[PDB]
Amino acid sequence: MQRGNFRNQRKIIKCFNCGKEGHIAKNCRAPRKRGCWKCGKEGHQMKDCTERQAN
Ligand SMILES: [Zn+2]
Ligand SMILES: [Zn+2]
């Protein structure tokens, strides 16, 4: 029964850049796999890393 008011199919569920799904490649800060580099561990992140110093 006719056709129109739609067509743009695509379905872009596969990033061109990283390959991984969920985002488009325009918005690809594809993961750089390192937890805390500042020490080396991957328990924590530099934005948190002061080792520890209480309140
Ligand atoms: Zn990507
Ligand atoms: Zn650290």
UniProtKB/Swiss-Prot annotation:
User: Which domain of life, per UniProt?
Assistant: Viruses
Post-translational changes noted in the entry: Methylated by host PRMT6, impairing its function by reducing RNA annealing and the initiation of reverse transcription.
Record localization: Virion
Which pairs are disulfide-linked?
A: none
What residue intervals correspond to the zinc fingers (CCHC-type)?
13-30, 34-51
This chain's function reads: Encapsulates and protects viral dimeric unspliced genomic RNA (gRNA). Binds these RNAs through its zinc fingers. Acts as a nucleic acid chaperone which is involved in rearangement of nucleic acid secondary structure during gRNA retrotranscription. Also facilitates template switch leading to recombination. As part of the polyprotein, participates in gRNA dimerization, packaging, tRNA incorporation and virion assembly.
- Name of protein: Nucleocapsid protein p7
Q: Which organism is it from?
A: Human immunodeficiency virus type 1 group M subtype B (isolate MN)
Q: Which gene encodes it?
A: gag-pol
